[PDB]
Scaffold this active site. Structure first.
Site, mmCIF file in Angstrom:
data_model
loop_
_atom_site.group_PDB
_atom_site.id
_atom_site.type_symbol
_atom_site.label_atom_id
_atom_site.label_comp_id
_atom_site.label_asym_id
_atom_site.label_seq_id
_atom_site.Cartn_x
_atom_site.Cartn_y
_atom_site.Cartn_z
ATOM 1 N N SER A 30 11.320 18.299 0.415
ATOM 2 C CA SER A 30 10.670 17.742 1.596
ATOM 3 C C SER A 30 11.724 17.386 2.637
ATOM 4 C CB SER A 30 10.001 16.406 1.310
ATOM 5 O OG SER A 30 8.880 16.547 0.485
ATOM 6 N N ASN A 32 4.253 19.665 1.194
ATOM 7 C CA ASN A 32 5.129 19.344 0.065
ATOM 8 C C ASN A 32 5.111 17.854 -0.301
ATOM 9 O OD1 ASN A 32 8.296 18.647 -1.059
ATOM 10 N ND2 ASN A 32 7.387 20.658 -1.697
ATOM 11 N N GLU A 49 1.537 -2.841 4.572
ATOM 12 C CA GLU A 49 1.791 -3.739 3.470
ATOM 13 C C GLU A 49 0.906 -4.954 3.456
ATOM 14 O OE1 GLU A 49 5.005 -1.571 1.764
ATOM 15 O OE2 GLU A 49 3.661 -3.172 1.090
ATOM 16 N N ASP A 109 1.532 -6.162 -6.701
ATOM 17 C CA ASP A 109 1.389 -5.021 -5.850
ATOM 18 C C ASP A 109 0.512 -3.941 -6.495
ATOM 19 O OD1 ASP A 109 4.741 -3.372 -6.005
ATOM 20 O OD2 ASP A 109 3.093 -3.624 -7.400
#
Length: 164
Positions: free
Chosen positions: A117, A132, A11, A20
Protein backbone atom coordinates in the site's frame (compact mmCIF):
# COMPACT_ATOMS: atom_id res chain seq x y z
CA UNK A 1 -10.65 20.67 8.70
CA UNK A 2 -7.32 19.69 10.31
CA UNK A 3 -5.80 16.50 11.68
CA UNK A 4 -7.01 17.29 15.17
CA UNK A 5 -10.65 17.58 14.20
CA UNK A 6 -10.26 14.53 12.01
CA UNK A 7 -8.95 12.39 14.83
CA UNK A 8 -11.45 13.78 17.31
CA UNK A 9 -14.16 12.50 15.00
CA UNK A 10 -12.59 9.06 14.68
CA UNK A 11 -11.70 8.47 18.31
CA UNK A 12 -14.30 10.34 20.30
CA UNK A 13 -13.62 11.92 23.74
CA UNK A 14 -14.02 9.94 27.00
CA UNK A 15 -13.17 11.28 30.46
CA UNK A 16 -13.30 7.98 32.31
CA UNK A 17 -11.12 4.81 31.65
CA UNK A 18 -12.76 2.84 28.88
CA UNK A 19 -12.10 -0.19 26.72
CA UNK A 20 -11.24 0.37 23.09
CA UNK A 21 -12.56 -1.67 20.15
CA UNK A 22 -9.81 -4.24 20.88
CA UNK A 23 -10.72 -4.31 24.54
CA UNK A 24 -7.79 -2.24 25.76
CA UNK A 25 -7.84 0.28 28.51
CA UNK A 26 -7.94 3.80 26.99
CA UNK A 27 -8.85 7.32 28.11
CA UNK A 28 -9.46 10.71 26.43
CA UNK A 29 -9.05 10.94 22.69
CA UNK A 30 -7.89 7.43 21.85
CA UNK A 31 -4.96 7.41 24.33
CA UNK A 32 -4.04 3.75 24.93
CA UNK A 33 -3.07 3.18 28.50
CA UNK A 34 -2.11 -0.49 28.59
CA UNK A 35 -2.75 -3.74 26.76
CA UNK A 36 -2.88 -5.39 30.23
CA UNK A 37 -6.07 -6.87 31.57
CA UNK A 38 -5.78 -5.15 34.84
CA UNK A 39 -7.89 -2.06 35.41
CA UNK A 40 -5.40 -1.52 38.13
CA UNK A 41 -2.43 -1.60 35.82
CA UNK A 42 -4.49 0.99 33.84
CA UNK A 43 -5.15 3.33 36.66
CA UNK A 44 -1.49 3.25 37.44
CA UNK A 45 -0.46 4.14 33.94
CA UNK A 46 -3.00 6.83 33.96
CA UNK A 47 -1.63 8.53 37.08
CA UNK A 48 1.90 8.27 35.74
CA UNK A 49 0.77 9.86 32.49
CA UNK A 50 -1.09 12.79 34.14
CA UNK A 51 1.10 13.33 37.12
CA UNK A 52 -1.74 13.13 39.64
CA UNK A 53 -3.90 10.58 41.38
CA UNK A 54 -6.70 10.45 38.98
CA UNK A 55 -8.68 7.64 40.20
CA UNK A 56 -9.67 6.68 36.52
CA UNK A 57 -10.97 10.04 35.60
CA UNK A 58 -9.49 13.12 33.89
CA UNK A 59 -10.61 16.63 32.87
CA UNK A 60 -11.11 17.92 29.31
CA UNK A 61 -7.88 19.84 29.60
CA UNK A 62 -5.95 16.69 30.57
CA UNK A 63 -7.42 14.77 27.65
CA UNK A 64 -6.47 17.50 25.23
CA UNK A 65 -2.99 17.65 26.67
CA UNK A 66 -2.57 13.90 26.02
CA UNK A 67 -4.00 14.38 22.58
CA UNK A 68 -1.47 17.11 21.74
CA UNK A 69 1.35 14.82 22.82
CA UNK A 70 0.11 11.83 20.87
CA UNK A 71 -0.28 13.73 17.59
CA UNK A 72 3.21 15.23 18.01
CA UNK A 73 4.69 11.81 18.73
CA UNK A 74 2.86 10.35 15.67
CA UNK A 75 4.29 13.06 13.39
CA UNK A 76 7.85 12.76 14.77
CA UNK A 77 7.61 9.01 14.54
CA UNK A 78 6.76 9.18 10.84
CA UNK A 79 9.64 11.62 10.26
CA UNK A 80 12.09 9.29 11.95
CA UNK A 81 10.94 6.17 10.34
CA UNK A 82 12.83 5.09 7.20
CA UNK A 83 9.84 3.44 5.64
CA UNK A 84 7.36 6.16 6.53
CA UNK A 85 9.20 9.40 5.89
CA UNK A 86 9.64 9.05 2.16
CA UNK A 87 5.95 8.32 1.80
CA UNK A 88 4.98 11.26 3.92
CA UNK A 89 7.32 13.57 1.99
CA UNK A 90 5.80 12.48 -1.28
CA UNK A 91 2.22 13.26 -0.24
CA UNK A 92 -0.02 16.34 -0.46
CA UNK A 93 -1.29 17.98 2.77
CA UNK A 94 -4.64 16.11 3.14
CA UNK A 95 -3.16 12.71 2.36
CA UNK A 96 -0.48 13.49 4.90
CA UNK A 97 -3.31 13.74 7.49
CA UNK A 98 -4.53 10.30 6.43
CA UNK A 99 -1.13 8.71 7.19
CA UNK A 100 -0.96 10.54 10.52
CA UNK A 101 -4.35 9.00 11.36
CA UNK A 102 -3.24 5.43 10.61
CA UNK A 103 -0.07 5.93 12.66
CA UNK A 104 -1.97 7.34 15.60
CA UNK A 105 -4.36 4.29 15.59
CA UNK A 106 -2.00 1.48 14.84
CA UNK A 107 1.53 2.62 15.68
CA UNK A 108 4.48 3.19 13.33
CA UNK A 109 5.34 -0.44 13.24
CA UNK A 110 1.92 -1.46 12.24
CA UNK A 111 1.72 1.02 9.40
CA UNK A 112 5.25 0.23 8.23
CA UNK A 113 3.88 -3.34 7.63
CA UNK A 114 1.62 -2.10 4.85
CA UNK A 115 4.53 -2.44 2.33
CA UNK A 116 2.50 -2.74 -0.81
CA UNK A 117 0.00 0.00 0.00
CA UNK A 118 2.85 2.38 0.94
CA UNK A 119 4.51 1.72 -2.42
CA UNK A 120 1.25 2.48 -4.21
CA UNK A 121 0.68 5.71 -2.38
CA UNK A 122 4.19 6.77 -3.14
CA UNK A 123 3.52 6.10 -6.75
CA UNK A 124 0.28 8.07 -6.53
CA UNK A 125 -1.88 5.13 -7.62
CA UNK A 126 -4.86 6.20 -5.54
CA UNK A 127 -7.46 3.70 -6.69
CA UNK A 128 -5.12 0.80 -6.45
CA UNK A 129 -3.85 1.70 -3.08
CA UNK A 130 -7.48 2.08 -1.74
CA UNK A 131 -8.29 -1.44 -2.85
CA UNK A 132 -5.09 -2.84 -1.29
CA UNK A 133 -5.55 -1.04 2.05
CA UNK A 134 -9.08 -2.62 2.36
CA UNK A 135 -7.53 -6.08 2.44
CA UNK A 136 -6.43 -5.96 6.02
CA UNK A 137 -7.51 -6.86 9.52
CA UNK A 138 -7.64 -3.08 10.10
CA UNK A 139 -10.44 -2.64 7.57
CA UNK A 140 -12.34 -5.72 8.70
CA UNK A 141 -12.25 -4.71 12.37
CA UNK A 142 -13.06 -0.96 12.09
CA UNK A 143 -14.66 -0.69 8.67
CA UNK A 144 -16.35 2.75 8.95
CA UNK A 145 -13.25 4.48 10.31
CA UNK A 146 -11.04 2.57 7.76
CA UNK A 147 -13.35 3.66 4.90
CA UNK A 148 -13.08 7.29 6.00
CA UNK A 149 -9.26 7.06 5.90
CA UNK A 150 -9.19 5.14 2.71
CA UNK A 151 -11.49 7.72 1.01
CA UNK A 152 -9.15 10.45 2.15
CA UNK A 153 -6.20 8.63 0.43
CA UNK A 154 -8.37 7.96 -2.59
CA UNK A 155 -9.64 11.51 -3.17
CA UNK A 156 -7.25 13.80 -1.52
CA UNK A 157 -10.19 15.71 0.01
CA UNK A 158 -12.06 15.91 3.37
CA UNK A 159 -15.28 14.60 1.90
CA UNK A 160 -15.50 11.55 4.18
CA UNK A 161 -15.58 13.75 7.19
CA UNK A 162 -17.73 16.63 5.94
CA UNK A 163 -20.70 14.69 6.76
CA UNK A 164 -19.65 14.02 10.39
Amino acid sequence: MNVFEMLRIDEGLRLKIYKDTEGYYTIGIGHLLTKSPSLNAAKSELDKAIGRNCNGVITKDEAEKLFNQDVDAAVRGILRNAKLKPVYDSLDAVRRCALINMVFQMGETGVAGFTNSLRMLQQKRWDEAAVNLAKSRWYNQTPNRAKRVITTFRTGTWDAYKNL
